[PDB]
Structures are given as structure tokens and as C-alpha cells.
Amino acid sequence: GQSLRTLQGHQSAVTSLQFNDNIVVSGSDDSTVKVWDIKTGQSLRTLQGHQSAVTSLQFNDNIVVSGSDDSTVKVWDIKTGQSLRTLQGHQSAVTSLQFNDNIVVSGSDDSTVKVWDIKTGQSLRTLQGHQSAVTSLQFNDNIVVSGSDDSTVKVWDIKTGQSLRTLQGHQSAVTSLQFNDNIVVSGSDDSTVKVWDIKTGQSLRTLQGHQSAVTSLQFNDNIVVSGSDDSTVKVWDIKTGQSLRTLQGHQSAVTSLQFNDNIVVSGSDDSTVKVWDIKTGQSLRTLQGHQSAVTSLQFNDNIVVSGSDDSTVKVWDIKG
Template sequence: MQNEVAGILSRFKSLDREKRKVFLLSLVEECDPHEIFTLQQVLESKGLGRFDIIGALPPELAVKIFAFLSGKELCTCREVCKTWMNITNESTIWRLKCLELLYVNKGITAAQNLNIPKEGWKKLYQKQYRREINWNNGQVQTIKFLRDHTERVTDAKLKENILVTGSADRTVRIWNIETGECIRTLCGNSFSCVDFLIEEKIVAASTFFRASFIWNMETGDLIRELKGHVSAVRCISLSRSYVASCAFDGSLIVWNWKTGEKITTILAEATAIRIFNNTVLSHSNSSIKAFDILNGNCIFSTAFNEGQLGWSYVQNYLSSKSAEESTNEFPDQIVLSLNILNTLRNYSNSLHNFDTRRGRMVCASNQQSSDILQLILLNDTGRPKEIVYPKGTSTDILNKEIFRTLSIDHRRIIIGCLSGTIAILDFDEES
């Protein structure tokens, strides 16, 4: 390319400033982004290195070029000159940066539905970037405690700003964790597991006494009571049409939660399950299997000796895939996700949860004495980082607790304790 450009630029010096702009515009339009640097080098060799190619372009084209840069690179470019500073202040660029982060953290659907922030795109990106730095360094910014449960927290599910928890105190509670408010309390029996769907506005929970319940999240009305297991239910999972549960008796039962119809009963010996569209994925002591919901047939099976740590990673990995990505190609995806687990053997006896989009894990020792939270970056060969609590926080409260559940998303860690206390560790800096 250098020889080509050198020939074209042989007449460049004879052009006035306006003609140079037109000339460069036509030249840059034919360049790939990575070829801009080569163009700059050729100009320097012709004694024209001080000519600002980017600044000479129409603003909309300069913005498109700068949009290929990272946030850190944009901050460096804004120091070059006033023209570049004005370009890097364009909200279009920072909107794209925000969408990129949101896509990585929450998927394409969330990115498509992002509204214009009150603080502006640049401020929002700065907030997101600082949160990522805090996450990667284990620097918790705030800790909040929720204390309405009176006995141990047995399960917790976090989606967006809604947290649903089950407890041995015979209640399921729905929380808005932005405000810390318990917005709904659902009563029944001692609950072993929970799940919910925001889009369908339903909550499902199972008890140690073989029954499962479906409620309306907004009204608290009981939609359905489902029975069929002959021993305690150990895991429950919801989809838009179905609810699946597995029990200590080895059975996996799928219902249509809208009608109450029992679809199929499968002898799966499952310890945990996850439902995806028309397929339910189950984990036993030695294998992962996928079953077709409509006929109960096994459509995929693989030996699996990674234990609960591996299963936790696999089901988080599959559930993090966007709606536009297939969740039916189980063999390839499972093989891919298992490759990362070899470095995590030492944490198999800990409570753990994964932020699989970012390649991060949080684990906590499940000892009766002081629990230690650690942040592990799966693509990082360095030593795990202990979570650093904010100054002035009464961390002795957390240190005295025995952790029973652990849930995370791209910005928070949720800990359910034996006492019934729920701790929310947030990595967002306060405005």
C-alpha cells in the first residue's frame, strides 16, 4: 500500500487546503481502519507529517474512525489538540462504548433496550468503566444488609434489580435491591429452591415437603400448586411455558405451569437442572444429560466428573447466551466451557458463582469459622484476590456469618447467610 499511496500523494503539495480535504476524504473512504496508520506514515515520509488527517475530515467521518478506539485510547487522543478533544466529546462515540460494555455484561437484548441516560453517555461510560476496575480489583464500594428472613437462606436468584430468596422460615421474599425494600412476601412451607421470570412476572418455589408453587410476582396470588415427587425437591427451573423440578427420589418432572398439566416424568437421578426452551439439562454425580421436554427422550449425554463447580459454570455459561444464540448445541458449548475448569480444582468445596460473560468467579469458603470471599478472574493466571470491603464498614457482621448461598451479576455479589441475613456487596461507586 505504501507505494500506491506515495504515487497518489506526489501531487498533494500543490493542492490548497480545501482541495486537500476533498482529496483526503476520498482517500480515507477507501481505507480500512488499520490502514490509516500506514497513510500517516507515508505523509510523514513526504514531509507532511504535521497535517492532521483526522481533523481535516468531516466531523461525522472522524467520529466513525474514533469509535474504533477503546475508552482508554480515546482519553489519550483528547489530549492531542482541541480538534481531537471536540471529536472525542461526541456523545455518539460514548453511546457505542456503553453499548459494548452492556452487551458483554448482559447480552444483546439489554443493549438494544438501553435508554438515553440522564447523566449523558460519557458519564455513564465513566461510571461503568470504574465499576469494571473495582470488580477486577475486588474493591467493594458499598455493603447493604437485608434482614427480614428469620432463618437460614436456602436459595437466592438475582436478575436485573430483582432478588428472590427462599428460606427455612417458610417464606419466599421478593426484593428490590436498589432500594433494599422487600416488595412481596409469599408464605407456605420451608422452601428449598426458587426461580423466577421477570418477563412473565412469576415466581416458582419448591419445599422440603415435595410440593412446588407458582405465584404472580406483582399480586402475590397463587397461580398453581404442583405435586408429584415423593421426596424433597432439590432444584427448580422455569421457562416461558414450563417448570421443571428434580427431587431426592431421582425423578425429574416437567409441567406446563400455565395449565398445570404434567408433561413428562424422567428418571434422571439429577442433583441440579436448568430448563432451556424445549430442553431440560440435568446434572447427576457423573454425567450431564439433555432431555426433550415433550417426549422425555435423552438427546445428549456426556460423562461429567467436574462436580457442582463444573455444573455451576456450565449452566451459567449456557444461560448467559443471548436469545439470538442457540442453546441447543449442548456438546460443543459444554466442551468449550469445561476447558476453563482445570485451574479451579482447589475451589470445589467452596460456595461459588460465575460471571461467565466476563470470565470471573466469586468463591467463599464454607467453613464454620470466618468466611473469606475471593475474586478469581478465569483468564488471569495470577493469585486470587480477596474481596476488599469499603472503609468504615462494620465488616465484623459479615465475618461472623456462615454463608449458605452466593449469587452474582456483573456489578454485585449477593450472600445469603445461616442467620437469615442477606448481604449485598456493590461495586458501583456512589454518585
């Protein structure tokens, strides 16, 4: 439950983060990405180049990929801080991204998803069809799934670029999504989570119970965990579509969550992170220390890392 390090240096909100056993990488409204030592707290390098807020990022052993309100995606050499490619083509903010060894996939306020060659920096495909901002995306070797402010989820063939399915039924923006070989799970401003058959496009379940927008979700074979503007996290049985637990305790919207077999970790506009026993619904720990909303988090067996509107990242001992 104890704060281990406070990573100070960003000049505005932290929007996004990822960590491994050695480093934290954070993206900020101040238009930079920072690389930090997870154990010492030291700022290691600052990736400067974007002209507006960084919204989204991912990294591996060689590169960082960042997306920005300036409408670009940048690829950086994590080992030197040098900008390797700027992916230009979107007409408005990049909101979401994912990459693998070959390709970057980006989503934008311009309503499109683009597929790029990560080595050359050239666009391969533009996925056209949404009628408003793309908010979220995921891909694999075969398909892209995108969620949009137009209230739909779209499933695309990643090699050809063709729309395969448009999942219709949400009554407001899709905020979040995840998929596997069988199902798509989407969360919406309409306060529901929906489960869909990815091959047929059939709506399989509507998880009803939240009293305001669903902001975040994760699922596995057994359960969905959702976070909401109503300040709760809900745990659902995916098979019946019924809620198992409501995790109550946050005083404002839940913005972010992650779970494993034992625990849920949630971040909130109330400035705290909470650790919960997923089996019982009980709060195990409240991580107090941020001075404004928690926007983003990640955890493992040992530590939580949280990012905040207060411009800091914090590293916590998740046990005590």
C-alpha cells in the same frame, strides 16, 4: 468491596436468590420466599405457603417459581404475592427448577424430573430413569439435561419424554451441570468436571485437579470455572482440558460462583465472597460481613448479592 445493604428478615438460612435492577428475591430454610428492594433494603413481600425449606427459585416480571423440601413447586404472582398454582406430584423434595413462558421443569429427591404446564399447573411429562436424587437440571426447547446422585447425567427429549443419552463415567454424585448446543459440562463429588458431546454422549474431557467434591461450575466457549470443597476455584481451558489458574484464598469450601470476561466471584463456607481477576488469578476484593457460609450469589457490573446460612442477604459494591 463495601457492604451496601443487609437484608434481614428470614428466620433461617438463605438457600437461593436472584436479582434484577430493582428487586432481590430470596428463598430460605424458613419455608418462605422474600421480595426486597435492592436499593433500600426494604422487605417488600413475603411469599408464604411452602411447608418446608425453599431450595430453588426463579423469577421474571410476572411470576416467581419456587421449589421446596415439601415436594411441591409453587407459582406466585410477583406483583401481588398471591399463590397461583401448586405443582404436586413429586414424592420427595424438589431440588432444582427452571421455567420459561410455557413450562416449568423440576428435579426431585424422588429421582424424577417433571415437565409442567406453567399456566394450567398440570404435569406434561415425567422423566423416569435415574436411580437416585436429581440434583441439577437445565432445559431448552428441545432437551432436558439432568444430573443425579446416581453419578450420571441424562439427556432427554423434552417433547416426548424419552431418554436420549445416559452419560456415564463419574464415580460419585453429579452436583452441577451446564450445557449448550454442543457439549454438557458436569461437576461431581468425585472431584472432577467432565465435558461431554451432547449428541454422541462421548466423554470428551475429564478435568482433574481438585482434591474434593466439585460444587459449582460455569463455562463458555473458552473456559470452565469450577468451585470445590477443597476451598479453591479452578479456571480451565476447555479445549485442552487443562487448568489455567487455581484461585486460592478461601479457608473453606467454595459453594457458589459466577464469572464473566473479567472476573470470577466465589462464595465460601468460610463466610466470605471473593472477587478475582480471571486473567491473572489475583484476588481483587474480599467481601467480609456474613457470619456463616455463603450459599448463593449473583453479580453484575455494579453489585454482588450474596445469601448466607446466617439468614441474611447482603448487597455489595463490587468495585470498592
